[PDB]
């Protein structure tokens, strides 16, 4: 099911640039209550109206540990509204196709070419982490942190 962070529900506001092509960042993070599982869609943060990502930094804290880890994250842009609790919303592999981070604690940066080719849409959209493969053992309380750079006036 959808696990919402504070940014999606509207509790924690998200920044928008007040200038054309002014790089803006916010620490889209969530603290994971219970353990992650296959098919989990984590709605991390909302990408603002006309902005497009220009660099995304993903950092996670050793989600599954265990041994022979098999976890693999997959973040993207969801088609649904800003914060609706509809379990039919899907996550595409735009930014990170297969992060393979969280197998061991570390930081990965956007590498797939599709990361910088996202098109603008006049409505807000929610960036969502989808755990593609189930994690070995797993852990509870480990946080998912996405750092997103977007510019609000690209052509």
């Amino acid at each position: 099911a959808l696990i919402q962070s504070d940014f999606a529900q509207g509790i924690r506001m998200t920044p928008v640039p007040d200038c054309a092509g002014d790089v803006t960042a916010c620490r889209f993070d969530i603290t994971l209550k219970n353990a992650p599982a296959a098919g989990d869609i984590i709605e991390l943060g909302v990408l603002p109206g006309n902005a497009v990502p220009v660099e995304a930094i993903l950092d996670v804290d050793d989600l599954d540990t265990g041994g022979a880890p098999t976890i693999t994250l997959d973040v993207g842009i969801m088609s649904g509204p800003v914060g609706k609790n509809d379990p039919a919303r899907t996550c595409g592999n735009e930014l990170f196709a297969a992060s393979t981070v969280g197998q061991a604690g570390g930081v990965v940066r956007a590498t797939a070419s599709s990361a910088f080719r996202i098109q603008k849409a006049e409505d807000h959209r929610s960036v969502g982490v989808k755990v593609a493969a189930g994690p070995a053992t797993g852990a509870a309380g480990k946080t998912i942190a996405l750092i997103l750079f977007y510019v609000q006036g690209t052509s």
């Binding site: 504070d6 509790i11 924690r12 007040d18 200038c19 603290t31 609790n85």
Partner: protein
Amino acid sequence: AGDRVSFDLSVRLRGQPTFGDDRVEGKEENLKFYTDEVIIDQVRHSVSAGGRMSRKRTAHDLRKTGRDRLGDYFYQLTDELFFMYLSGARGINKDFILPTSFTGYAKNPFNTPDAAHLLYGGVATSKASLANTDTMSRVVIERANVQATMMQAQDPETANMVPVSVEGEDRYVCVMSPFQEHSLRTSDAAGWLEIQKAAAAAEGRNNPIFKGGLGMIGNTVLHSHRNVVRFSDYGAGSDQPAARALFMGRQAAVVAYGTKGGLRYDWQEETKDYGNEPTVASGFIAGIKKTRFNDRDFGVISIDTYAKDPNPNNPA
């Protein structure tokens, strides 16, 4: 000019008098004083009646609605801040504006009530011993009255809690989470139903069972309000709901408004992008602390009963 306020407590005398004709010019008291600090800070928010086109594809003007929403938002924010400090912690209360990871305002941090001012429901001794029988009951608020009376007779270092001029005169106010009121008025073990059924036998349709909320119990005006902190980690193995009824008396908490003549909402107006997205932002300058003289708080007893969602159909 100054971001802190200090106020003083003068405790009583505790020295043995010298009987007989023994001279007493030497042995003398030393008056003891206690202090606490309230640190001010600035809290502001901004609403964005944005867009030049977005204000034309809508029949309603958005600036006035934004202003009204900001007013209501600051109303509920100050109210929930009051209940958050008088309770000492943030739980899982979801309608609260502030995020679930909240720790302070202006480095005046959250202060968990001591063992002396922390009263559990039913029979219990710690946050890890609540069960289904530790629901809030008439017995519990009577224990709260007994604590408010003989708090000094057990701890010789605290200070007497004294009543507030509520309704008629001199009654302790006991705010209640609206799940605890349901636990009282919808259970026979809570003990409220029997006495109020007797009262109904005295007065026909004006009894609190039919025509209102809870009534006074031992000169303790009970009120119920949404913004009462509600925890979710209590229990022997966690995942058991809880609450914190507030048993208030006189100087429970101190407010230091940072602007003249009480809090003043000053609205600031600025526009972005060559005249698009007009934005309104305002904010008060204040700071709130729960009076904590010595290491024992001064005005509130935090009844910490167990209160579950009555209707389980709610989304978690």
